RNA sequence: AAUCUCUUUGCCUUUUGGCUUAGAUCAAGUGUAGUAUCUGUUCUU
RNA sequence: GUAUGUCUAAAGUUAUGCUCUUAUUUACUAACAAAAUCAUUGAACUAG
């Protein structure tokens, strides 16, 4: 049975720089933050989940405050991610189920009772009713909510071999990419289960992370090498030979990257505490803000219009805003 | 003392190797190598020149 | 002018081309039974 | 140009195909490590010993 | 009397781990695809 | 086409200059493919 409270509709709005130190932190889950995202395109809101099971929306202005909590999850939080439109996001957990959240009524539009965990969900960025999900058994389901039949399950990806680590859409959704603990990265096509490229190498590590570039050019890949790497999104989607981002420690953490709004930057968390950043044409590591806790910072967001604030948050619980 | 005299001089030992070891990967003027044990074969084939 | 000398040089360069942290004792056996 | 690229690379290999496998299969079993390590250190964070 | 760095000498310290008929033969190929790769042009710098 | 190897992922809970767009060149790989001169005929067939 799921519970949600109210303590304020919030879903209407109300050249970058580097970030320097962190100005502000928000209570975050006690036992650990393992999602966090900013509210699309406008950012004046955080969706975050952890290991409390609960997930919590929280105003990015203001007095800060939490606006909405969401209790439908037996198990700590594994993925979050917003619709196009923002009015629903999709919550996924070790309790085997992604349900989809009314993100202003908090009410479930639906829910899936899976075999296997939700390692990572998505949503089609030209469509709201249809979703990905990847599993921890390989498989990737597609969904669509508006069918009834099997439940709206109107796509089954089956070509990886090992869990799925990471999924992440093209921006017009008409393609979308995932990797997984086969050391492989692949890109599908809607609905056809035929990868159009395989992204696979000798020395390539697994990729726990992927993300786009605003530029909608090129898109990041944070690998267990303890390196970023880039791929053009264009066809044949071969590898950036001098968009290699160093520095940062991430061997052994699903740690998240992202992108400046204007695209000029990329950052990333750090496994000891840190949040990482990049000049996006050289590569070169500008900046390594220390972030309070002493724990890995898994999880890291940089605001869509904001020239600088940047989120992140991990084991400590808390999350901090630098800017 | 016995203890911290063993450590101390085996420690300058091995870096003194580890000098050694760079100024060999750097010097040049030895017979064409593909690789680093070639080019430590090619050293060891000319020292029996002397 | 190409060279033998020359060539065998960029096949050295050619073929001259992660660090994970123990937490706890279950990753030390771990480590130490692979060892 | 196309003569002497082939020839570099004919020139450089020096192991056998069983070698080869062994490489790129420790790395693999590195990979397979660390996604091992990576779901025992987020359950364990969660409590899940 | 005790450091540091040079140079020589010594040490070679990641410094070729069997056998047979050189073990044997081959290296002329269409479409499409896959992977790597090449020149140029703008762009990055 | 094999030999053969690997995988199968909840629960049956053990107490705390340097690049990019893109049109080509070259190499390698493909039991993928019934390809028009030289009363209808390679045709289901080849493996350490």
Redesign the interface.
């Known amino acids: 049975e799921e519970v949600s409270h109210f303590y304020g509709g919030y879903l209407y709005p109300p050249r970058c720089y580097l970030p320097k130190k962190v100005i502000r932190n928000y209570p975050g889950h006690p036992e650990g933050t393992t999602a966090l995202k900013f509210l699309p395109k406008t950012g004046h809101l955080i969706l975050s989940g952890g290991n409390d099971h609960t997930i919590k929306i929280w105003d990015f202005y203001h007095d800060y405050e939490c606006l909405r909590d969401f209790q439908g999850h037996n198990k700590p939080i594994k993925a979050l991610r917003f619709t196009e439109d923002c009015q629903s996001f999709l919550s996924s957990s070790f309790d085997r189920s992604v349900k989809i959240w009314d993100t202003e009524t908090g009410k479930v539009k639906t829910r899936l009772h899976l075999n296997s965990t939700p390692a990572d969900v998505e949503s089609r960025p030209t469509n709201p009713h249809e979703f990905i999900v990847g599993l921890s058994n390989s498989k990737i389901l597609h969904y669509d909510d508006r069918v009834s039949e099997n439940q709206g399950l109107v796509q089954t990806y089956d070509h990886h071999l090992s869990s799925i680590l990471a999924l992440k859409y093209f921006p017009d959704g008409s393609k979308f990419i995932s990797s997984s603990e086969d050391k492989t990265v692949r890109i599908w096509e809607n609905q056809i289960n035929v990868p159009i490229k395989q992204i696979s190498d000798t020395a390539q590590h697994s990729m726990p992370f992927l993300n786009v570039h605003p530029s909608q050019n090129y898109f990041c890949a944070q690998s267990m090498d303890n390196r970023i790497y880039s791929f053009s999104l264009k066809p044949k989607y071969k590898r950036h030979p001098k968009k290699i981002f160093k520095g940062h420690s991430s061997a052994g953490y699903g740690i998240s990257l992202a992108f400046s709004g204007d695209g000029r930057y990329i950052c990333s968390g750090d496994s000891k505490s840190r949040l990482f950043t990049w000049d996006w044409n050289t590569s070169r590591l500008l900046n390594n803000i220390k972030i309070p806790g002493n724990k890995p910072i898994t999880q890291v967001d940089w605001h869509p219009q904001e020239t600088s604030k940047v989120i992140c948050s991990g084991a400590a619980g808390k999350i901090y805003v630098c800017d | 003392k016995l203890a911290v005299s063993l450590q101390s001089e085996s420690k300058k030992r091995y870096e003194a190797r580890k000098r050694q070891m760079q100024n060999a990967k750097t010097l040049y003027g030895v017979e064409?190598?593909?690789?680093?044990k070639n080019?430590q074969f090619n050293e060891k084939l000319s020292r029996e020149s002397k | 002018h190409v060279s033998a000398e020359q060539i065998l040089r960029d096949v050295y360069k050619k073929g001259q081309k992660t660090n994970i942290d123990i937490l706890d004792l279950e990753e030390l056996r771990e480590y130490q039974r692979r060892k | 140009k196309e003569m002497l690229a082939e020839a570099r690379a004919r020139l450089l290999n020096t192991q056998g195909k069983k070698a080869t496998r062994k490489i790129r299969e420790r790395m693999l079993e590195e990979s397979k490590r660390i996604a091992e390590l990576q779901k025992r250190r987020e359950l364990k964070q969660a409590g899940i010993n």
Request: net charge neutral; charged share 35%.
């Open positions: 064409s190598f593909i690789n680093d080019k």
